[PDB]
Amino acid sequence: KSKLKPFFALVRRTNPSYGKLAFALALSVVTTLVSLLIPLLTKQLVDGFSMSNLSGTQIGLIALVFFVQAGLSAYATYALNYNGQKIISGLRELLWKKLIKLPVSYFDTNASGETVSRVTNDTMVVKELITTHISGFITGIISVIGSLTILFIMNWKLTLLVLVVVPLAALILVPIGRKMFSISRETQDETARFTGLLNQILPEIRLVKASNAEDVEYGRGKMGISSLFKLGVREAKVQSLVGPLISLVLMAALVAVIGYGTAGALVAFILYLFQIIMPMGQITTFFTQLQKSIGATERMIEILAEEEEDTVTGKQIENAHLPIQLDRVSFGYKPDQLILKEVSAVIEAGKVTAIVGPSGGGKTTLFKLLERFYSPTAGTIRLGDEPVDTYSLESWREHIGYVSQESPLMSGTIRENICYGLERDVTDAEIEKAAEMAYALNFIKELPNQFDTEVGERGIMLSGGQRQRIAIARALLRNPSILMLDAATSSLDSQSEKSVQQALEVLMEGRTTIVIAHRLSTVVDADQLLFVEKGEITGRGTHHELMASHGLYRDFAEQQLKMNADLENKAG
Amino acid sequence: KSKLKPFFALVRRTNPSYGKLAFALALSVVTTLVSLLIPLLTKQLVDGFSMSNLSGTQIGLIALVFFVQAGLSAYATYALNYNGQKIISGLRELLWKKLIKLPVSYFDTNASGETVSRVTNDTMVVKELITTHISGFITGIISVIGSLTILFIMNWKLTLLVLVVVPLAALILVPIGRKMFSISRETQDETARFTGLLNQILPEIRLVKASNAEDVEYGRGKMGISSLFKLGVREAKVQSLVGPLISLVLMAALVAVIGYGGMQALVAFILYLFQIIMPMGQITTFFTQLQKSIGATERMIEILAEEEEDTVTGKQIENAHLPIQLDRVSFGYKPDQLILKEVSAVIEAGKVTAIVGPSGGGKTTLFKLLERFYSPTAGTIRLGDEPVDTYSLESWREHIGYVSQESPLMSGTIRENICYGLERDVTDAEIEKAAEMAYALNFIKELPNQFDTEVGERGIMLSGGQRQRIAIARALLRNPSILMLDAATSSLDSQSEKSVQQALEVLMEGRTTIVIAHRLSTVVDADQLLFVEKGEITGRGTHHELMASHGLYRDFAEQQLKMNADLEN
Ligand SMILES: CCNc1cc2oc3c/c(=[NH+]\CC)c(C)cc-3c(-c3ccccc3C(=O)OCC)c2cc1C
Ligand SMILES: CCNc1cc2oc3c/c(=[NH+]\CC)c(C)cc-3c(-c3ccccc3C(=O)OCC)c2cc1C
Ligand SMILES: Nc1ncnc2c1ncn2[C@@H]1O[C@H](COP(=O)(O)OP(=O)(O)OP(=O)(O)O)[C@@H](O)[C@H]1O
Ligand SMILES: Nc1ncnc2c1ncn2[C@@H]1O[C@H](COP(=O)(O)OP(=O)(O)OP(=O)(O)O)[C@@H](O)[C@H]1O
Numbered sequence A: 001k002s003k004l005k006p007f008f009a010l011v012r013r014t015n016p017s018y019g020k021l022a023f024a025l026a027l028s029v030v031t032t033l034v035s036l037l038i039p040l041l042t043k044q045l046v047d048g049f050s051m052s053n054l055s056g057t058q059i060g061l062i063a064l065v066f067f068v069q070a071g072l073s074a075y076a077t078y079a080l081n082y083n084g085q086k087i088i089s090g091l092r093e094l095l096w097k098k099l100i101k102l103p104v105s106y107f108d109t110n111a112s113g114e115t116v117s118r119v120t121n122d123t124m125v126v127k128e129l130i131t132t133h134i135s136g137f138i139t140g141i142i143s144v145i146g147s148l149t150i151l152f153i154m155n156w157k158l159t160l161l162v163l164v165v166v167p168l169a170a171l172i173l174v175p176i177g178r179k180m181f182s183i184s185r186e187t188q189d190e191t192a193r194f195t196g197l198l199n200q201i202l203p204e205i206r207l208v209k210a211s212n213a214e215d216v217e218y219g220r221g222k223m224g225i226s227s228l229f230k231l232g233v234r235e236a237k238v239q240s241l242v243g244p245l246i247s248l249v250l251m252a253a254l255v256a257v258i259g260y261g262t263a264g265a266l267v268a269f270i271l272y273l274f275q276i277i278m279p280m281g282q283i284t285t286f287f288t289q290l291q292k293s294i295g296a297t298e299r300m301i302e303i304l305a306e307e308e309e310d311t312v313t314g315k316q317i318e319n320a321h322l323p324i325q326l327d328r329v330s331f332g333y334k335p336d337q338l339i340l341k342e343v344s345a346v347i348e349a350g351k352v353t354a355i356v357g358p359s360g361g362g363k364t365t366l367f368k369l370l371e372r373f374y375s376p377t378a379g380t381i382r383l384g385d386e387p388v389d390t391y392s393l394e395s396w397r398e399h400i401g402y403v404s405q406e407s408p409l410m411s412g413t414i415r416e417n418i419c420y421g422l423e424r425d426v427t428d429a430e431i432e433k434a435a436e437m438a439y440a441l442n443f444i445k446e447l448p449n450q451f452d453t454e455v456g457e458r459g460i461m462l463s464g465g466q467r468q469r470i471a472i473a474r475a476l477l478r479n480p481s482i483l484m485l486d487a488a489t490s491s492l493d494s495q496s497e498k499s500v501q502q503a504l505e506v507l508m509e510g511r512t513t514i515v516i517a518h519r520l521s522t523v524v525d526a527d528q529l530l531f532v533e534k535g536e537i538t539g540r541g542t543h544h545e546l547m548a549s550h551g552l553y554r555d556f557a558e559q560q561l562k563m564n565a566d567l568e569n570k571a572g
Numbered sequence B: 001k002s003k004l005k006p007f008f009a010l011v012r013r014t015n016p017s018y019g020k021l022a023f024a025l026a027l028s029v030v031t032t033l034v035s036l037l038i039p040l041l042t043k044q045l046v047d048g049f050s051m052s053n054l055s056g057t058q059i060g061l062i063a064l065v066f067f068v069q070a071g072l073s074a075y076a077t078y079a080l081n082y083n084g085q086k087i088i089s090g091l092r093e094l095l096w097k098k099l100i101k102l103p104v105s106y107f108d109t110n111a112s113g114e115t116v117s118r119v120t121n122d123t124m125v126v127k128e129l130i131t132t133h134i135s136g137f138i139t140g141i142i143s144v145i146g147s148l149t150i151l152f153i154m155n156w157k158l159t160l161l162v163l164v165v166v167p168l169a170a171l172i173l174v175p176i177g178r179k180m181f182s183i184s185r186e187t188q189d190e191t192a193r194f195t196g197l198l199n200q201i202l203p204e205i206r207l208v209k210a211s212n213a214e215d216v217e218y219g220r221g222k223m224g225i226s227s228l229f230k231l232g233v234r235e236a237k238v239q240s241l242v243g244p245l246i247s248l249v250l251m252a253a254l255v256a257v258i259g260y261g262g263m264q265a266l267v268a269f270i271l272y273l274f275q276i277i278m279p280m281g282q283i284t285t286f287f288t289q290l291q292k293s294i295g296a297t298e299r300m301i302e303i304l305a306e307e308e309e310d311t312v313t314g315k316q317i318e319n320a321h322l323p324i325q326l327d328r329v330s331f332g333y334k335p336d337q338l339i340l341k342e343v344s345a346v347i348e349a350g351k352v353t354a355i356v357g358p359s360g361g362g363k364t365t366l367f368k369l370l371e372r373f374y375s376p377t378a379g380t381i382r383l384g385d386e387p388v389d390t391y392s393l394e395s396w397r398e399h400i401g402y403v404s405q406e407s408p409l410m411s412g413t414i415r416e417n418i419c420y421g422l423e424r425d426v427t428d429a430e431i432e433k434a435a436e437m438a439y440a441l442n443f444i445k446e447l448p449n450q451f452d453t454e455v456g457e458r459g460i461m462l463s464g465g466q467r468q469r470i471a472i473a474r475a476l477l478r479n480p481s482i483l484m485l486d487a488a489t490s491s492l493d494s495q496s497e498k499s500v501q502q503a504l505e506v507l508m509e510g511r512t513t514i515v516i517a518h519r520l521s522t523v524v525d526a527d528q529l530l531f532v533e534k535g536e537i538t539g540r541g542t543h544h545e546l547m548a549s550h551g552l553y554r555d556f557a558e559q560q561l562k563m564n565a566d567l568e569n
């Protein structure tokens, strides 16, 4: 509620920040003393240089030694940079850990491509403050406190004026700080929009070559930068405005000194007064960057309070395998326009069961919440007549492989694209078997040295036929007791399909499998078939039973068979 | 070659920097002069100010307004910073335009996730050079020359001590910049690496949920951060080193005062030489930062030197329409290894043709080739016995729709996902007409306000089945000369494809259509069925003729025939 307390609270979280900063400033503290004492002794010392020949060698040696300790100020600067280059490091560390552990429902709203720049750019702004200006603040406060002390006429007898410089200046600065804080909160919250705009586009250049997108996309980029970032000059305008105003209040000090004038002391008093300008320049800049840095962090703190969906809180049960049943459970991908309708069905183990649905139904999310991304609102999910949430929050997941409507990959090689599931016992001799069981070997060995082979960003180097096949190798290698194929027909030929169907049947006899297929033909043989329509289910039983006994559609399957019926008369 | 001329050349291509910068420096010039003359007047003004306040007030108020005019130097800093804010915006502008128009080939060998950061974090460093220290480089250079010229006996009779202060310091700085320059190319090429890692991790979070990746992939971020950027402190090490080294060179001049000046005012000499300290330090920092900026921009320049392939240099607009022909085509995705073998086929116009093949064949590469993304090394691609290359590079694309094997979508409103075909005259009246021929509105109008609804990053908000249709609308809206359905059955049901196929038949009757579809049942009735395999073509003609006449498979169709025949029994 103060725009200040959370900041110093957040930097405190990086524990090693206490190690050297106080030591760093203290080294700079003595640097201030020698600087504030050198000019008052050189005039006396040069008077002692009336001969400057025999003693000059010793003082020259002394000056040699002393000016090395003048160079010692850099060691404070190096340390000050060092501790700063740590407080940024842990800040990235602590954020990045928190940026994955939070529920996927958060990412379905906040445009992940935008929030990436809140790791790089929304911390680099702190760097300029933490290193240089802080030294200015320390070197200034000691200088100003070391200024009025010699003003003994001014700090014990003529004090009515030293106390008027700060309240006026700060009163002037407060609007400036508030304005600039309203700037930094934007310049960061548009960098994220800008850097986000690219990764939503640039990795997809294949489409943006639509023969006119390049014109339009170039338009969006420019309107992103020029109309916003160059208009960030608004920060520059207020940043330069401080000079006059910080000189203005100081001017008022001077009208006060001439209005309360005795004669033999004021002459030196004016000279002493003309020393505090440079400290005032540094101190005013510190607060300017201070409330600047906050706006570069105001967005960051909020993503440090989202509720960490994953826990290790698996109470006492992880392993005993029992069927999975959903009891009157309904879910909303949006908290009001619920898209599902109190599904109730049972998944008997040891027997594969298939969901088939027309495009627009509730197939995908029924997987996406059966892996407990969402914890649906109405109803619940059980296995073994026990609540699933009592098993774990995501330690349950490792017993379950998964592929998506798509087949995503990551920029590593084809090796560490399959490994990180078990991530301890890769068992190089077994990566082969999983690729075999996904029919991946026989069209990989021809590639240049599988381990050496490299995908593009989204797996452009591999292809659609190869992309889907390599994805399920992740699921079959993880050795699960619960499996989800998601598109056995996405991008792969019938040649691939028969081998895959002939392969995973050999493993998954006592390990329950739930698969959804684009075409009804691939999973007719399964021991149970659901038929999801717009969040409801209006069919059960085996497909052969479903045809004759049940008659809601009676033609969804027949909408497939008349497609293939042309293949008999025209062929023989 | 010299690694400094291109920088002033790279800045040069952004024109407007030269406009107001001279006025900015000129203000800094008079800023230096007034700072040069301020101490001389005050030490004698106080003698005049020694008079009572009756005369002091009349002069003090004039000194006050002088101070406000001394405050005018602030608006000089704004001028530099604005000029700086102009040059950084220009660098982003030029870089962004060159980034789009390069051949797609570069965006595969390189990584898009890497190059994104080179527009945000690889120009911001140039700000800190161009804002403050550029003034220091000017303030120092005038002050040092002015201060040296004050030594009017030392510059014409005892010049030995002025030829050592600067050149010896420069000799010391030579390794410092060289070490610093090597740092910037490393730190910037790793910030690029770090930002590259994240944009290919977060968007696919649903698969980093492998129940152990949250521990492992988090480690990759740390190992990227901690072992590199907390070790990026290594430049802060040498950046401190300027202090001690500028010390020895100048004290070496301090001992030179007795090395040659001990035989000859002298006290005024010592006073003045203790004033060149801050200017020399200020100007020294500028060179150090310069070698820092040059490194963070030496990788920057290189991607301004690619072929910027797309042009309008094709002196044709494609008014006519003739069939597509492939003449002895052989393409390789790498100049050494090739996946296409002398393929020869004629795409008959105005009547649908198809390509069917197995996984990992040459199907979709032949699409990217026929869109002329790559211009194959061997053979040629022509239409009507005229090469495609003479026509244009990407005005031809405007006549050909293209839906990909995956279902791509930019982020925005699903309206805006289809709008930019004509990019000017969206003509709201018949967007639904494109959707109806794509079977979309029956599963769109029920949603909240077709325009209002917005997809996520890769269409996460809509479904995969929905996305593949919503992409195919972009194909039909362009009303193209050539239609390219790449995945007609990827993610969509039987209730879709029947309504889909029945729609395109009316639309394209004299407009040729190239389609590749799995599950051969869906392309049985096309005029020409082509078989591709490992970069070679081994089939022609109608499906019924190719069935028994050719003898390669005789069972590839039977592949699904026996797979689908089980439903009846
Ligand atoms: C309180 C009112 N008194 C003054 C306030 C001043 O404010 C200044 C603010 C500045 N901006 C800071 C961001 C800079 C750069 C120089 C300033 C000077 C200045 C300007 C030109 C030449 C020399 C000096 C100077 O400081 O030397 C005086 C001997 C300055 C001088 C006086 C007397
Ligand atoms: C060549 C060796 N001789 C010197 C080198 C120096 O290097 C300095 C480098 C600096 N870094 C630049 C980025 C800064 C900030 C101050 C420096 C001072 C300095 C430090 C504290 C107080 C006053 C001064 C100072 O300069 O005033 C001397 C009267 C300094 C002084 C001397 C004598
Ligand atoms: N943000 C959202 N996330 C998931 N589903 C959504 C969202 N918004 C709406 N939906 C609805 O939820 C359904 C989820 O799609 P689903 O996972 O079933 O796709 P699918 O399994 O590939 O099948 P389809 O062929 O219908 O795409 C869609 O039909 C869609 O209408
Ligand atoms: N970036 C790439 N571009 C082209 N080919 C690649 C690339 N990376 C790898 N390849 C290799 O080139 C071959 C051709 O793949 P292609 O993209 O033609 O498959 P496809 O036509 O998508 O197959 P399917 O249609 O069955 O998915 C692949 O077997 C693959 O091994």
Ligand SMILES: [Mg+2]
Pocket: A363, A364, A365, A367, A404, A405, A486
């Ligand atoms: Mg799904």
Ligand SMILES: [Mg+2]
Pocket: A463, A464, A465, B363, B364, B365, B405
């Ligand atoms: Mg393909």
